[PDB]
Amino acid sequence: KKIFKPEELRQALMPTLEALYRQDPESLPFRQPVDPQLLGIPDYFDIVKSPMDLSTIKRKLDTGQYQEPWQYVDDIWLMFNNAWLYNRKTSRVYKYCSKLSEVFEQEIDPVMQSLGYCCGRKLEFSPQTLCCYGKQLCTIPRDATYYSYQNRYHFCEKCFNEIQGESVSLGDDPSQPQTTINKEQFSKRKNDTLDPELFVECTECGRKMHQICVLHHEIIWPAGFVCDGCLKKSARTRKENKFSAKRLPSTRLGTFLENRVNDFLRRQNHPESGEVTVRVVHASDKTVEVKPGMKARFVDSGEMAESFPYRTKALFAFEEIDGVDLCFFGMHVQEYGSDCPPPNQRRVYISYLDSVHFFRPKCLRTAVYHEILIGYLEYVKKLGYTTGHIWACPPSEGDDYIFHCHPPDQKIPKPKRLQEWFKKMLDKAVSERIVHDYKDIFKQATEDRLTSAKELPYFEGDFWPNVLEESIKELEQEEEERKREENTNDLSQKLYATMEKHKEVFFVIRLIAGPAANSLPPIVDPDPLIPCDLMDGRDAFLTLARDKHLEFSSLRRAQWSTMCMLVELHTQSQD
Ligand SMILES: CC(=O)N[C@H](CCCCNC(=O)CSCCNC(=O)CCNC(=O)[C@H](O)C(C)(C)COP(=O)(O)OP(=O)(O)OC[C@H]1O[C@@H](n2cnc3c(N)ncnc32)[C@H](O)[C@@H]1OP(=O)(O)O)C(N)=O
Ligand SMILES: CC(=O)N[C@H](CCCCNC(=O)CSCCNC(=O)CCNC(=O)[C@H](O)C(C)(C)COP(=O)(O)OP(=O)(O)OC[C@H]1O[C@@H](n2cnc3c(N)ncnc32)[C@H](O)[C@@H]1OP(=O)(O)O)C(N)=O
Ligand SMILES: [Zn+2]
Ligand SMILES: [Zn+2]
Ligand SMILES: [Zn+2]
Ligand SMILES: [Zn+2]
């Protein structure tokens, strides 16, 4: 065990502070105990229930009030915090209030490392937005009027105004107990709260180190968290992690993809490259019910099928950066087999694909992405799939597709860039004879001489299924306006117009064409099913990540979130 003598700890940290005093005149407002009256602005010590400055910190060091180094850091952070809040951004104090902390980080993190503390920043997570319980499908917005109760239950600005009357007479749980509460019992606030990062304490230090920074998962090492410094001295090595991505059950598809990538990296012989692991972590058969509009007009009529059976898979690429697993790519696909009703027969469609851009080396990052997406096509081609489908639609502002909370400097590409992005790899696939050719959806329709909406493939979550229901309704009210006026290719037209509107956003990839396309044995996936509820679509994993704060915003947190999700897959595989 180790304890901090005040005068030994001063010696470490005084440089950091005396450096902060040096900023001229950035530090000058911060040098002494700000007092309302004298500074002429009456509400400062009526808003902040605690007061601080450098001199107070400076005295706290010398007198010997600091047991642990984080007290010092927190008080310094508090001084920026409580000052930022008080003054408007456009004022001068605010500007300095950042320039010092900028020095502060630069300086403090290596200084903490000398002390054996891994890092040296006060860290918090993102605004953890909550969710609805009354409407069940809805959610609780951030920085908005919010309603809640008992911390466990949250409700929207529109929720409790028209559910069970003014009084809260609806408390429902799986267990019998119920509850009736009054209208005015609720607690109002605006979601601005920030939840702070957790820490873990070592066996022989008691040191309050970041969970993320030291990367300690309770489950992987239940013996107890030992930091490396203690391990180093005792000549020890943390017992091997068995919850690694490499240790996930292998598959033909996973191995196909991780070889195509790792063979490519070996060709490149780049100095920064490490080996990649590609894993299919969910495989399960499913159905897509035809929508009510198209239902009556077609499946009830006896023209098209009532449902379409497919297979949903979830594959994830990982990389060994600094001897630590890191997930940087994820994908969701829909495989419609040979025992499937047309038009959907022998087709693969990419529901969602996503990434966090920490792949090393950066220069090979995009090329690695293309190799997966090409490898997926080649694989499914070999099984005898014919047509691949992509909806090249980037997410909207603040929306995560798979990985929760991306890095701030990960530029979400504009629809033209992403369009060109796919064009590049398909071009690469075309040259490799993996892909024969491809076209946009509109021109494919023209090529196929399509005459009715039942000849257009129907996929889960696609644009067309949800627009075809809407397109029909426009025609239903079209007659309604017609009849009222009168007193004193029906739907093939509507679609073909919409396809002309959005032609480039949708690809149609022709894996096989012509002679082979006819004489084809049935499709037989050589991989079993992989039941997993966590990776059964994107919403389940985001929820766990939004709840347990598994962010991919930084490298350090992605290394954490990856480790967490890996353990959740190795233990969802335990019944
Ligand atoms: C229903 C509905 O309507 N909508 C939806 C459902 C819709 C359909 C779902 N469809 C799909 O899933 C299939 S399309 C999936 C598109 N996926 C994403 O967008 C995920 C987020 N994007 C990414 O992960 C990446 O951009 C990735 C696509 C993997 C490509 O990364 P990259 O690294 O290969 O290239 P780069 O990103 O172009 O960047 C390449 C260079 O890009 C530069 N750059 C990127 N973006 C920009 C930019 N925007 N402006 C200027 N420069 C920019 C980037 O910084 C960089 O510089 P360098 O590499 O020199 O440092 C819903 N569910 O509601
Ligand atoms: C009389 C008097 O008073 N004063 C003066 C005379 C004084 C004496 C003259 N002294 C000298 O001549 C010797 S020191 C010369 C300094 N000259 C310059 O700086 C010219 C402008 N900068 C550059 O040409 C390049 O940056 C260069 C330093 C040559 C190489 O840069 P790089 O590319 O190898 O590294 P990077 O730029 O640091 O980093 C590049 C990585 O960091 C990036 N990044 C760079 N800067 C920043 C930043 N500031 N903040 C965040 N990120 C940042 C950069 O984007 C990047 O990202 P990536 O990984 O994506 O590539 C007078 N006479 O007027
Ligand atoms: Zn730390
Ligand atoms: Zn609501
Ligand atoms: Zn220790
Ligand atoms: Zn390179």
UniProtKB/Swiss-Prot annotation:
Changing residue 352 to W: Loss of activity. It is found in: Cytoplasm; Nucleus; Chromosome. Changing residue 460 to R: 90% decrease in activity. 90% decrease in activity. Residues 4-111 form the Bromo domain. Acetylated on Lys at up to 17 positions by intermolecular autocatalysis. Sumoylated; sumoylation in the transcriptional repression domain (CRD1) mediates transcriptional repression. Desumoylated by SENP3 through the removal of SUMO2 and SUMO3. Residues 242-574 form the CBP/p300-type HAT domain. Signal peptide: none annotated. Changing residue 459 to A: Abolished acetyltransferase activity. Residues 352-354 are annotated as: Interaction with histone. Acetyl-CoA binds at residues 353-355, 365-366, 412, 417, 421. Residues 475-487 have a biased composition (Basic and acidic residues). It comes from the Eukaryota. The modification N6-acetyllysine is found at residues 135, 291, 428, 454, 494. Changing residue 354 to Y: Abolished acetyltransferase and acyltransferase activities. Abolishes autoacetylation. Does not interact with TFAP2A and inhibits transcriptional coactivation of TFAP2A by CITED2. It is linked to Defects in EP300 may play a role in epithelial cancer. The CRD1 domain (cell cycle regulatory domain 1) mediates transcriptional repression of a subset of p300 responsive genes; it can be de-repressed by CDKN1A/p21WAF1 at least at some promoters. It contains sumoylation and acetylation sites and the same lysine residues may be targeted for the respective modifications. It is proposed that deacetylation by SIRT1 allows sumoylation leading to suppressed activity. Interacts with HIF1A; the interaction is stimulated in response to hypoxia and inhibited by CITED2. Probably part of a complex with HIF1A and CREBBP. Interacts (via N-terminus) with TFAP2A (via N-terminus); the interaction requires CITED2. Interacts (via CH1 domain) with CITED2 (via C-terminus). Interacts with CITED1 (unphosphorylated form preferentially and via C-terminus). Interacts with ESR1; the interaction is estrogen-dependent and enhanced by CITED1. Interacts with HIPK2. Functions as a histone acetyltransferase and regulates transcription via chromatin remodeling. Acetylates all four core histones in nucleosomes. Histone acetylation gives an epigenetic tag for transcriptional activation. Mediates acetylation of histone H3 at 'Lys-122' (H3K122ac), a modification that localizes at the surface of the histone octamer and stimulates transcription, possibly by promoting nucleosome instability. Mediates acetylation of histone H3 at 'Lys-18' and 'Lys-27' (H3K18ac and H3K27ac, respectively). This is Histone acetyltransferase p300. It comes from Homo sapiens (Human). The lineage of its organism: Eukaryota, Metazoa, Chordata, Craniata, Vertebrata.
